[PDB]
Amino acid sequence: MSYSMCTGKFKVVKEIAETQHGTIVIRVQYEGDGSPCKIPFEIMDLEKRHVLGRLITVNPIVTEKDSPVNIEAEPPFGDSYIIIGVEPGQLKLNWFKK
Amino acid sequence: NIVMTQSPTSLAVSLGQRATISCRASESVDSFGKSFMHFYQQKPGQPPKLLIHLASNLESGVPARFTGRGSRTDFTLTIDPVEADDAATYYCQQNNEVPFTFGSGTKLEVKRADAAPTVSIFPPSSEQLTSGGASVVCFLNNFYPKDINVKWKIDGSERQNGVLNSWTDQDSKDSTYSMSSTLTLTKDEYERHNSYTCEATHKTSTSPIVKSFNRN
Amino acid sequence: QVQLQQSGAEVARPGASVKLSCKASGYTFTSYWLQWVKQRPGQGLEWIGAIWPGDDDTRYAQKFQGKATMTADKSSSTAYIQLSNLASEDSAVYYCARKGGFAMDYWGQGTSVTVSSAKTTPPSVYPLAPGNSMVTLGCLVKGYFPEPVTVTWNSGSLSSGVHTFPAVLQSDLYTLSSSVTVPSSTWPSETVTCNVAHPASSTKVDKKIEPR
Ligand SMILES: [Cl-]
């Protein structure tokens, strides 16, 4: 896939939680009209200048509209921004790892 | 805030040639491996029209003669070949971050063959005169290039005061410009003179195009 | 058929307020951002903000924070923009647009806002008749306020050869002219009429061009 990025908005269904492997889990629900589309996801430093962590979820896609999508990622140690969706209404979540 | 710098402010391109409009961002407009900048076209009296999204994705229904290119901070819009209908103002926009910002705009002038104006003079209407007004109207239509000067004469004497001029935007079909010149006088001054002259001077002739009427 | 129908042109005194409307149809109103863009006369575009009608989420450009207020009504599929403590810098065309995908795909026709203490006055419409081969006729739309006016020929039937000139401002009043060029065979045998509309004064004038 092949699908284009979701153009609409996301709602946080499950807030960031740390796993036993130090990774993070989040659940977001799509609100727009892209039907199946790739979730725009990126982890950055606080100045939004460098891309940092890695996605564990291979290619997160919205399958259904009103169904949450699980996203798991390995953030960098310290402070980072978990960025989800396009602007306006892009989610920018703070995270501190160990 | 991201600043979008468009250059040039304006450019004249001959029909069938290539037009390249530049647009530069003050910071990277990239996110998720995509460039969050887009190109719009605005024709006079109309809302803007989206041409290209995400730097290079042509909108449905827009001719493939329009192409977007670029990443991070440097972007270009290319129109090739340039057509008459392309006479408009082009804007770039970023929506990588809030507030979304636009460029200042680039006016694309379509460069065609020189054409002399079609001059028409009109006396004040009876309706206007019955209400104490007297406007003498002169149309200078379908000319190229845009540069033209109008001179009014009342019984052979030049008149500068009370003259209002207005130019149209470039015609989307024939690439020409048109202009209207209105000489407003009092019913009294109008009624005390006979000869009213509208003299147009354009690149197309060394001699001025002269249209007139006598109040008789 | 995606459509955004905006409310008509408005005049307001300095320090007053206006509430503009944008009726959306042809799509799920609650599944897209509805955005507002400002264009001052002879100037560029500026993004005011966006509203997500599904939950009333807004994003404003800082400069418009105190100035503009975005609301939306789910039931009537209508978005509104309220502009407060009006000043001359607020005189502009206000567009509503749908952010259909990655950018603004569908736009409303725009609402013109004139901030002035000047009095709304209807225009005087005068026929311009000649005193050969192709004949030029015209209409003079004199002394109106505020902008805009709508000029048509034969209720829109005559579209080719028409030149409606930008208005010129003199003594707080606008004056505009429109010309129509038609074959000699078509005038005066067939009627030529200019149709002038001034929304602010609720004026609609049809002026037949009769030969001199
Ligand atoms: Cl946008």
From Swiss-Prot, chain A:
Cite the post-translational modification comment: N-glycosylated.
Q: How does it sit in the membrane?
A: Multi-pass membrane protein
From the Swiss-Prot or TrEMBL record, state where the protein is found.
Virion membrane; Host endoplasmic reticulum membrane
Q: Which cysteines are joined by disulfide bonds?
A: 6-37
Quaternary assembly: Homodimer; in the endoplasmic reticulum and Golgi. Interacts with protein prM. Interacts with non-structural protein 1.
Function per UniProt: Binds to host cell surface receptor and mediates fusion between viral and cellular membranes. Envelope protein is synthesized in the endoplasmic reticulum in the form of heterodimer with protein prM. They play a role in virion budding in the ER, and the newly formed immature particle is covered with 60 spikes composed of heterodimer between precursor prM and envelope protein E. The virion is transported to the Golgi apparatus where the low pH causes dissociation of PrM-E heterodimers and formation of E homodimers. prM-E cleavage is inefficient, and many virions are only partially matured.
State what protein this is by name: Envelope protein E
The major lineage groups are: Viruses, Riboviria, Orthornavirae, Kitrinoviricota, Flasuviricetes
